[PDB]
């Protein structure tokens, strides 16, 4: 209703209705729009836990720490 164009999700490939009718006009899901940018990894925001054995592989880990 009132502008109802369908946009295809560029992350998974799905026809999602855009305009004034559905709650998620942009992308089919929140995760699809997220991965679309490319700044979301298994971690939330940086990894505070570091050390132990082979934990947090980001820079200079080594088998000693
Ligand atoms: Zn999608």
UniProtKB/Swiss-Prot annotation:
Ligand binding (Zn(2+)): 9, 12, 28, 32
Residue ranges of coiled coil: none
Bias-annotated ranges (Acidic residues): 54-65
Region forming the signal peptide: none
Biological process annotations from GO: regulation of DNA-templated transcription
Cofactor(s) this protein cannot do without: Zn(2+)
UniProt keywords, alphabetically: Metal-binding, Zinc
Keyword set includes Translocase: no
Region: Disordered, residue numbers: 45-65
SUPFAM superfamilies in the record: Glucocorticoid receptor-like (DNA-binding domain)
GO molecular function, one term: DNA topoisomerase type II (double strand cut, ATP-hydrolyzing) inhibitor activity
Cofactor binding summary note: Binds 1 zinc ion.
Matching HAMAP family: DNA_gyrase_inhibitor_YacG
Subunit note: Interacts with GyrB.
Family statement drawn from the similarity comment of this UniProt entry: Belongs to the DNA gyrase inhibitor YacG family.
Role played: Inhibits all the catalytic activities of DNA gyrase by preventing its interaction with DNA. Acts by binding directly to the C-terminal domain of GyrB, which probably disrupts DNA binding by the gyrase.
Entry protein name: DNA gyrase inhibitor YacG
Native organism: Escherichia coli (strain K12)
Gene behind the chain: yacG
